[PDB]
């Protein structure tokens, strides 16, 4: 029931995050706004688990390490940092970024645990009931794009919560904000593809997601450079579709 999962996830995410967005500007109750955001983030995971509970392969993909293809380890570790530093290099012909290598941007230990927790709470849902529901009705290629769109529009309430990444980028420039929502599209394709190449291993998707977040924190870049990064992501997403195009369009 693909029509039920996403619409139910869409509404639960939207009720909790927009409530947390109201508290985020409240001068009285701002102290608790982050504990309302938590179930909002955890929604796709709990919805997915409930639908499954209401198969052994979900258990398998959760605990079976043998599903993982070790040939994809270099691309799991290295691709995002490579993309980031390439973006800085591509920036240089255009004005600025000489300073950027310095990586001036970026307590240090707990924020890791939070990033790993968010990568977990997201992928348990997306790599659970979510993408399987789409791939059953659709070709892999349009299932991945339908996922990319939903996942992008899933971040939509964050624009309205005080001091969030989505908030600040739109606060600064309309182009910085749109660039983010545009970048979720090829990002949803790359992570998805990586999951299939490792036999739908949810654990690997967690690691990959976590690694994408980590490198985006440690190796910080300006919003102007992130626009270039988005393009690099489209070129990588396009290249991946071409390499596995038979897999992408087969029925």
């Amino acid at each position: 029931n693909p029509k039920l999962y996403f619409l139910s996830t869409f509404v639960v995410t939207y009720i909790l995050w927009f409530t947390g967005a109201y508290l985020s500007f409240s001068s009285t109750y701002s102290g608790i706004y982050m504990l309302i955001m938590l179930p909002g983030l955890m929604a796709p995971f709990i919805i997915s688990t409930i639908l499954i509970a209401k198969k052994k392969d979900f258990i398998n993909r959760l605990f079976n390490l043998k599903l993982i293809n070790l040939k994809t380890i270099p691309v799991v570790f290295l691709l995002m940092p490579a993309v980031i530093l390439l973006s800085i290099l591509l920036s240089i012909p255009f004005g600025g970024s000489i300073s950027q290598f310095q990586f001036s941007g970026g307590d240090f230990v707990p924020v890791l645990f939070l990033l790993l927790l968010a990568a977990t709470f997201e992928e348990l849902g997306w790599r659970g009931y979510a993408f399987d529901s789409l791939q059953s009705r659709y070709s892999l290629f349009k299932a991945s794009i339908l996922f990319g769109i939903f996942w992008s529009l899933w971040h939509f309430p964050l624009i309205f919560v005080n001091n969030s990444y989505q908030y600040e980028i739109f606060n600064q420039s309309i182009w910085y904000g749109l660039n983010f929502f545009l970048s979720i599209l090829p990002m949803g394709i790359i992570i998805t593809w990586m999951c299939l190449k490792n036999r739908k291993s949810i654990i690997l998707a967690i690691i990959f997601h976590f690694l994408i977040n980590l490198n985006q924190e440690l190796l910080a870049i300006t919003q102007d450079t992130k626009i270039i990064e988005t393009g690099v992501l489209f070129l990588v997403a396009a290249a991946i579709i071409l390499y596995d195009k038979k897999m992408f369009f087969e029925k």
């Epitope: 500007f25 001068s27 009285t28 701002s30 102290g31 004005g95 600025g96 001036s104 941007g105 970026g106 924020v111 005080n162 001091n163 990444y165 600040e168 980028i169 606060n171 600064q172 420039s173 309309i174 182009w175 910085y176 985006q216 924190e217 910080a220 870049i221 300006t222 919003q223 102007d224």
Partner: antibody, heavy 124, light 107 residues
Framework: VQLKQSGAELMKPGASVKISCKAT????????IEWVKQRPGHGLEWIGE????????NYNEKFKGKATLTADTSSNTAYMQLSSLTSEDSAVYYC??????????????????WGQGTSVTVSS | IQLTQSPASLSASVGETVTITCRAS??????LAWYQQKQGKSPQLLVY???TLADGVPSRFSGSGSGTQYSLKINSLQPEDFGNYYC?????????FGGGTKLELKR
């Protein structure tokens, strides 16, 4: 990184002033420009901010209409215009920058560099 | 959100250690900066995110606090540390500064 502001002004009530703030040493379009008011006995008071390159602005409600922020990216200069001057407008005016925006570990939530200040006096 | 500084005035001698406090009327989630201002000069940044030293700032300065209560500490005051001090929150517009604290030379 340096912010140089224009010189002192002496004005009749009802006139307008345009204060400039020239930026050197960084990319002018990628950082917030702040404007702060300081009178003796009133401490620091925030006026508003502009993001050059996008033209986005966040104003204090009190200075809406009173203060007008603009920015020219070809000359790396931010401007603030004070209209309908009265005695209350007599103060020192600063422009200041915010840090570059990063998701984690940034001086973005700080006024990290300041201009030297522009003294404005308004009297008949 | 209004911010309140105490004390308004603080008398001290070279070598002493002093602490200035800042109170927010609402939770500002560590979005707090501290500035120093000499007479006739512009404010300079000392600390942001409540806890982080700005570039060039001596390590005798330090900031702490959370929620609604924040403070700045100067360990072993130097002659150059005498002047004014302000706190400022960055949680939500409008940004407000504290009334300031004047650190004067004891006599």
């Amino acid at each position: 990184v340096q912010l140089k502001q224009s010189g002192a002004e002496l004005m009749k009530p009802g006139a307008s002033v345009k204060i400039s703030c020239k930026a050197t040493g960084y990319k002018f379009s990628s950082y917030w420009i702040e404007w702060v008011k300081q009178r003796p006995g009133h401490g620091l008071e925030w006026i508003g901010e502009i993001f050059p390159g996008s033209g986005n602005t966040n104003y204090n409600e009190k200075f809406k209409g009173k203060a007008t922020l603009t920015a020219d990216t070809s000359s790396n200069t931010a401007y603030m215009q004070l209209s309908s001057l009265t005695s209350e407008d007599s103060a020192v005016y600063y422009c200041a920058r915010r840090g570059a925006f990063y998701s984690y570990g940034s001086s973005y939530y700080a006024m990290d560099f300041w201009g030297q200040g522009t003294s404005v006096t308004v009297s008949s | 959100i209004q911010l309140t500084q105490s004390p308004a005035s603080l008398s001290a001698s070279v070598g002493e250690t002093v602490t200035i406090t800042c109170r927010a009327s609402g939770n500002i989630h560590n979005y707090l900066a501290w500035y120093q201002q000499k007479q006739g000069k512009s404010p300079q940044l000392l600390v942001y995110n409540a806890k982080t030293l700005a570039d060039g700032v001596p390590s005798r300065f330090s900031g702490s606090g959370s929620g609604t209560q924040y403070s700045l500490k100067i360990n072993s005051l130097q002659p150059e540390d005498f002047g004014n001090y302000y706190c400022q929150h960055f949680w939500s517009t409008p940004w407000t500064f504290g009334g300031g604290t004047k650190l004067e030379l004891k006599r």
